[PDB]
Amino acid sequence: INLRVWALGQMVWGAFLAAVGVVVVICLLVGTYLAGLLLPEQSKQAPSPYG
Amino acid sequence: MVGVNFFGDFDLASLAIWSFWGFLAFLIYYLQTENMREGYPLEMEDGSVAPNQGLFPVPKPKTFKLPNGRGEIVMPSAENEAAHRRNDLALARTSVSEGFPHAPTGNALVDGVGPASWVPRRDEPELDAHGHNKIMPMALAKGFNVTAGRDPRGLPVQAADLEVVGRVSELWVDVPEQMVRYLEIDLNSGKKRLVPMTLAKIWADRVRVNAIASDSFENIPATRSASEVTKLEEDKISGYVAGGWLYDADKRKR
Amino acid sequence: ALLSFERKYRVPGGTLVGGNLFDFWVGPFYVGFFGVTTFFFAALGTLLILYGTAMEGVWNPQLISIEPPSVENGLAFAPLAEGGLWQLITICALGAFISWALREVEICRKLGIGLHIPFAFSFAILAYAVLVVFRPLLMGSWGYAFPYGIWTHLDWVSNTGYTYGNFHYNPAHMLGISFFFTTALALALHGALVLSAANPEKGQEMKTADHEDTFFRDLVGYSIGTLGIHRLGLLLALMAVFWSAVCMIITGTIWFDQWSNWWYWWVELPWWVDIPGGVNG
Amino acid sequence: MSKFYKIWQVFDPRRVFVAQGVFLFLLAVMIHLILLSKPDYNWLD
Amino acid sequence: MSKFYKIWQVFDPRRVFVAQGVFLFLLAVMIHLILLSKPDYNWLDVGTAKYGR
Amino acid sequence: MSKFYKIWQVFDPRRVFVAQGVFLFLLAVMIHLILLSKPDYNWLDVGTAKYGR
Amino acid sequence: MSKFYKIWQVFDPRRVFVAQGVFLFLLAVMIHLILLSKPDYNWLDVGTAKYGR
Amino acid sequence: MSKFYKIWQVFDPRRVFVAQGVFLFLLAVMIHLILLSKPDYNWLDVGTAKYGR
Amino acid sequence: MSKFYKIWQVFDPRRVFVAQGVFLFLLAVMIHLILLSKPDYNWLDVGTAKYGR
Amino acid sequence: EYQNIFTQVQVGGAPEMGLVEGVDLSNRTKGTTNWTLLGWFGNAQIGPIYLGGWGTVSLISGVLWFMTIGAWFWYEAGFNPAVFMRDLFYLSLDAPDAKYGLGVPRDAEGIMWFIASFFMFVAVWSWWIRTYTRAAALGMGKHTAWAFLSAIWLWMVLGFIRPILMGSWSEAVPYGIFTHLDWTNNFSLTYGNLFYNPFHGLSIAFLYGSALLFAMHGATILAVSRFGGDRELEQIVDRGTAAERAALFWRWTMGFNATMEGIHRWAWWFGVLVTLTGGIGILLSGTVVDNWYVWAQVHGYAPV
Amino acid sequence: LSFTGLSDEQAQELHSVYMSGLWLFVTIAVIAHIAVYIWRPWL
Amino acid sequence: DLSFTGLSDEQAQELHSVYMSGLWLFVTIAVIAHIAVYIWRPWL
Amino acid sequence: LSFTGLSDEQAQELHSVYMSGLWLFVTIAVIAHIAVYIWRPWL
Amino acid sequence: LSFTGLSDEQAQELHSVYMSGLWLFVTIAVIAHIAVYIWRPWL
Ligand code: BCL
Ligand SMILES: COC(C)(C)C/C=C/C(C)=C/C=C/C(C)=C/C=C/C(C)=C/C=C/C=C(C)/C=C/C=C(\C)CC/C=C(\C)CCC=C(C)C
Ligand SMILES: COC(C)(C)C/C=C/C(C)=C/C=C/C(C)=C/C=C/C(C)=C/C=C/C=C(C)/C=C/C=C(\C)CC/C=C(\C)CCC=C(C)C
Ligand SMILES: COC(C)(C)C/C=C/C(C)=C/C=C/C(C)=C/C=C/C(C)=C/C=C/C=C(C)/C=C/C=C(\C)CC/C=C(\C)CCC=C(C)C
Ligand SMILES: COC(C)(C)C/C=C/C(C)=C/C=C/C(C)=C/C=C/C(C)=C/C=C/C=C(C)/C=C/C=C(\C)CC/C=C(\C)CCC=C(C)C
Ligand SMILES: COC(C)(C)C/C=C/C(C)=C/C=C/C(C)=C/C=C/C(C)=C/C=C\C=C(C)\C=C\C=C(/C)CC/C=C(\C)CCC=C(C)C
Ligand SMILES: COC(C)(C)C/C=C/C(C)=C/C=C/C(C)=C/C=C/C(C)=C/C=C\C=C(C)\C=C\C=C(\C)CC/C=C(\C)CCC=C(C)C
Ligand SMILES: [Fe+2]
């Protein structure tokens, strides 16, 4: 009853925080990739530094 | 001296880099030892000297000759550790085992524990080279005025509770360094209390002090004198105000 | 374990995540949620590096190198023997750095001091990120990130630079170098002055801040002050790191030619272009 | 084995529940990503 | 051997359980990764092979 | 010989226990990895060989 | 020779114990690695060759 | 010569002992590495060539 | 030279002794190394040439 | 919530002219200007300044050095101000030719370089003596001078010492913005890769450590400025809670800590070691080692 | 003892609900694993 | 007698009994897993 | 003389238990070494 | 004379125990050196 919903709320709040962090990291990375898609094509033709 | 090896592949460059490793070892030793003129010998949570005192030995005492007749300070010294020692602290052990926090028993702001802690400095003002007091009220600083920026004098003081506790009255200024250190507040209760400038943000219409709420502004430590402030009083005041970032957070709004 | 004055400061509070939980000390170290997390990430990354150099067969710590994936692999996760280990180590390093900074936050708000230190660390974290996350993403591959080796990431530096001729001609590079040089100069001078005041000539009383201000005024005619020098050095280091991150984020994303040819817009300015004489005429 | 309930006399259960939700979510996400990183186990493709 | 319970008169249960949990999770992750790093013992690739996928 | 117990009148058991635990774990890890770096003592590649995988 | 026990009146036992422990472990590691570097004293490769593996 | 005991009235025996130990160990290591460099004084190679390995 | 002993009224013996020791040691090391650099004053190579090894 | 990065309120009165502790008050100026733009960050008082023999010598010699370089720049531009402002960063008073070896060069560019470098020598050493004497007058330590001596050691290695050992003034540094960058690059190229110099790596370690350390230290002081941390000389003898809270932050963070006196020794040493190690490294290049990558290969930090 | 302050019975009740949720989670997970194994075996 | 923790012999014995119950359950699960893996893909 | 505050009886008991643990560790290590030697000798 | 606060008897006892440990260490090292010599001599 009350204790079950309390503990489930605690666990789901933890999961929601984790999901927010994941969403943030993914938004950052993906948006960087997209902004990279706006750059000139020589941005993708650079020679490797072998390392 | 190119390709001139004393033995094996060992030339002047290898000699130099190994010599530097040695010098650097000695230097780390010297620096870590010179970093031991305060805080030692190590203690337990019971206050006793610990079985482990470190891997670098505490160094030999040096002497600081103080100006203005203030005397001689020896570091390290049992006298310096005893003078700067707090006694009768209001803390209770959270656990019998070591490495666990100590909880305050009363009002940690008033009892001076935790981030509200203060060190027993000498009850004497900080002096300049000429022997005058370093911090003065600007009325007693001859020639001092507000050359730039906003004058806080006369502005109301907003607290963490978003309530107003009084109005700024005077500015306490470091004369040799020409900067504001504390601003004095006329409390609506009829009392004068100092507050560090570093913990006060001047807005156009108000001075915001988010560290402490309206309840705490009254119990701030007072100065025995109205023209001078001692190192001890400074430390008590600044500790009290800073402690509010933790012990006045439940009251803090916005 | 405790300094003579450490007891009164060991109180509860100052936690962002967890309360009573993880609020204790291991010797001197404060370990909270983020202390636990950064210990985990650091140990895992160290062990991953050790296993990688074991696989390679190399135990000389000066030849250990965990290289990223290839440029052809792109942004995909690679075989752990071909760059997946570098990727995991980079994830762990980011997590450990961020957890270190947030642990510093907790410690600061337990002690009642300002959060300047984790703010300053965040700049170095962000530069490391510019190098291993963001610039690779805009370039389209993790193979442009530097390897985890003592002397191989220097090869990466050299080759990345010489891909653009002399990297000295990048202007943000210049600014970063100037700020680094000035930071070292200012640190030397600050230490020298404080020690000259506190440890004066034999037979003389201890000095004050007046003597310091006076020394530097008599020397160069200006003294920035006790608080000013600290603000200044902090900001100097931060601006150095900022301009380094700028020099790198624009290097293969907005610039692709030798950096020396950038300056030839001031030479090709139409009013002094064809005048004869000098180097460019 | 029958006295495991004393772990709540050691650790506060609120913080433990929140941290466990976080842990389990991140672990599940990591495993889903590992599987998505493989064509045979990727289910979107 | 009969008196190992005295390790709790020495160490606090809380720090010990924290450390032990972190250590065990770290070690398990490390071994699972050591396995995944081998074309053999990688149960994913090995299963992909065994079943013709 | 019969008085080595005096080493606990000198060092604290908590610090000694923590130190020896870290030391032993690190030593074991390093020796395991040393053997794993030698393909002759990498037991995984061995089991891959003797079983034809 | 009869009076070497005064090194304990001059030196602290704890510091020297930890120091010589570190020194001995590092010296052991140093010599073991010196040998391992020489193919003629690497017991692992020597055993490999001795047994045909 | 009969008054050389007066250096202990000029020097702290503790500093002197620590510095002397460091100096002696480092000098010994240095000489041993010098000998290891030379092929004709490397005992490890000399024994190898002596016993046919 | 009758009154050279006054350099101790002038100078402090502890600093003098420390600096003199460091200086003499570094001088000796440098001279020995200069000799080792020269194949003719290398006593080790000379011994090799002398005893047929 | 106020980070103390900028000052909210400036106050000021009569100028702090200085302290009499051995100083000749006749050689010190009487003019001071207050500038508020600097007050938001540091102190606003500009001046006074001490004008003595050593400072006079250094000013004269350095002005002559600057002017010699500029005169060569004007010649190289053909007396055209437009070519002077166009090629300013590309113009250069270059080190002598190798044909002259170490003798007094027999060319205009080379002798101009020689005389400008003479003026530079005089100015820099005069300024060193200035620092020493300005500290000695106020009864202060000579730490500033011993720190400047390391930078002077590297500068000398570059301009005077190493050209001598290598046997040519052509090895020295030219007087130009881009030309001395080219000199650094060509120096690294001529001797393998200067990355693989160990003392170069040490100089870099300490350069990076200087910024690490000042970031840490300044962030610390601004973090404990609310307790009076910036007043360090009073915290050294009368310890307050600022010093204790700083020490404790760093102890809890990474296990060990310093004192309010003791972190400035770290600072001094990280500063001076940059240039000390750099000077040694530059000496060893060409004189003891012709290639640093092969040296690394032989000495076990580059693969073969 | 109760570092937290919970009595044996509070802890018993909380552990009861905890094991309930745990067994539910484990059942759901083993079901999902059976499904994934029918789809994509990994052993 | 000696207790750097506050736990007595009784408390320590109870805590240890539960600790070892958990340890042996953990080890049992790990042993079963190791058996299964050795059946499926041996390494020795 | 004691730097830790422990009496001879306390330290003797502590050492007895530490010895039990050390000998158990060494016994397991010895058995493992014997196994690995039978499986793949190094000497 | 003493710099660390140990009497003659305390230090004599400490030394007795330290020499016992040292000779045990050395005996083990000697046995191991003999073994390694028989296995693969170096002189
Ligand atoms: C292609 C470039 C080569 C290279 C070639 C060199 C060379 C060549 C040198 C170094 C040197 C240095 N390099 Mg580099 N360097 C490379 C790669 C790097 C990288 C990198 C991340 O890639 C870094 C971080 C560094 C870092 C450094 C510094 C650590 C070091 C110089 C310290 C210093 O303060 O000098 C600057 C300080 C001074 C010169 C002292 C100046 C003091 C004098 C007295 C000033 C007087 C002022 C004067 C009178 C005028 C005053 C004007 C008015 C008063 C206003 N280099 C690559 C591999 N580098 C130097 C060094 O130390 O060698 C090891 C050096 O000579
Ligand atoms: C490069 O060279 C290589 C690495 C290849 C080779 C070299 C290897 C080297 C040099 C290896 C060195 C190994 C060493 C030095 C190993 C040492 C091992 C030791 C000393 C192990 C000791 C283990 C001790 C244990 C496990 C003790 C356990 C104790 C307990 C479980 C009980 C603790 C005591 C209690 C609870 C009593 C408390 C009593 C009261 C009254 C409170
Ligand atoms: C390039 O150079 C090479 C390396 C090739 C060649 C060598 C060059 C050079 C320069 C070599 C130089 C060598 C030198 C200078 C060697 C000097 C060695 C000395 C002086 C060694 C002295 C050793 C002394 C020892 C080990 C003394 C030990 C004493 C004790 C254990 C007892 C001390 C006293 C005790 C314990 C009682 C104290 C009493 C009370 C009351 C506290
Ligand atoms: C590099 O080489 C590689 C990595 C490949 C090989 C290396 C392998 C290594 C180094 C392996 C090391 C393995 C080790 C050290 C394993 C150690 C395992 C142990 C010690 C496991 C212990 C497990 C304990 C468990 C699962 C305990 C569980 C307890 C419970 C579930 C409840 C207990 C209840 C309590 C405490 C409540 C009582 C409280 C009160 C207040 C009465
Ligand atoms: C590159 O050159 C190479 C490395 C190849 C060659 C050069 C090698 C060199 C330079 C080697 C140098 C070796 C040296 C100097 C070795 C020295 C070894 C020593 C001195 C070892 C001593 C060991 C002592 C031990 C293990 C003592 C153990 C003691 C105990 C277990 C009991 C401790 C005593 C107690 C508790 C006292 C009782 C306490 C009270 C309060 C009554
Ligand atoms: C508008 O133009 C006017 C004329 C009004 C003024 C303009 C002036 C201009 C444009 C000046 C520009 C100056 C520049 C760009 C200077 C740049 C200098 C740089 C970047 C120098 C870099 C390094 C220099 C070093 C390391 C010099 C070291 C020198 C020494 C150690 C001197 C050692 C002495 C030597 C070589 C021989 C002389 C010694 C004796 C005893 C005769
Ligand atoms: C065919 O003709 C024949 C056979 C004759 C050719 C053969 C020639 C040979 C075999 C020549 C051999 C020469 C050798 C092997 C010379 C050996 C010299 C030795 C063995 C010297 C011994 C000891 C030297 C010592 C202890 C020197 C100590 C020096 C100090 C400065 C120590 C005192 C000061 C210190 C430690 C620094 C602090 C200073 C103060 C004042 C406290
Ligand atoms: Fe400072």
Numbering used by the authors:
A (entry chain X): 14 to 64
B (entry chain H): 1 to 254
C (entry chain L): 2 to 282
D (entry chain 7): 1 to 45
E (entry chain 9), F (entry chain A), G (entry chain D), H (entry chain F), I (entry chain I): 1 to 53
J (entry chain M): 3 to 306
K (entry chain 8), M (entry chain B), N (entry chain E): 7 to 49
L (entry chain 0): 6 to 49
The authors write:
In purple photosynthetic bacteria, the membrane-bound RCs closely associate with light-harvesting complex 1 (LH1) to form the RC-LH1 core supercomplexes (2–14). The LH1 ring of purple bacteria captures photons from solar energy or peripheral antenna complexes, such as LH2, and transports energy to the RC. The RC then uses the energy to initiate a charge separation and electron transfer, ultimately creating proton gradients across the chromatophore membrane to produce adenosine 5′-triphosphate (ATP). Here, we present high-resolution structures of native monomeric and dimeric RC-LH1 supercomplexes from Rhodobacter (Rba.) blasticus using cryo–electron microscopy.
The RC-LH1 monomer is composed of an RC encircled by an open LH1 ring comprising 15 αβ heterodimers and a PufX transmembrane polypeptide. In the RC-LH1 monomer of Rba. blasticus, a total of 34 BChls a, 29 SPOs, two bacteriopheophytins (BPhes), 7 ubiquinone-10 (UQ-10) molecules, and one nonheme Fe were identified. The RC contains a BChl a pair as the primary electron donors, two BChl a monomers, one SPO, two BPhes, two UQ-10 molecules (QA and QB), and an Fe2+ ion. The LH1 ring comprises 30 BChls a. The intra-subunit Mg-Mg distances range from 9.6 to 10.3 Å, whereas the Mg-Mg distances of BChls associated with neighboring LH1 subunits are slightly shorter, ranging from 7.9 to 8.5 Å. In LH1-1, the absence of SPO-β is attributed to the steric hindrance caused by PufX. Within the RC-LH1 monomer of Rba. blasticus, five extra UQ-10 molecules (Q3 to Q7) were identified, in addition to QA and QB in the RC. Among them, Q3 and Q5 are potential UQ-10 molecules located in the gap between the LH1 ring and the RC. Q4 is sandwiched among RC-L, PufX, and LH1-1. Furthermore, two previously unidentified UQ-10 molecules (assigned as Q6 and Q7) were found in both the Rba. blasticus RC-LH1 monomers and dimers.
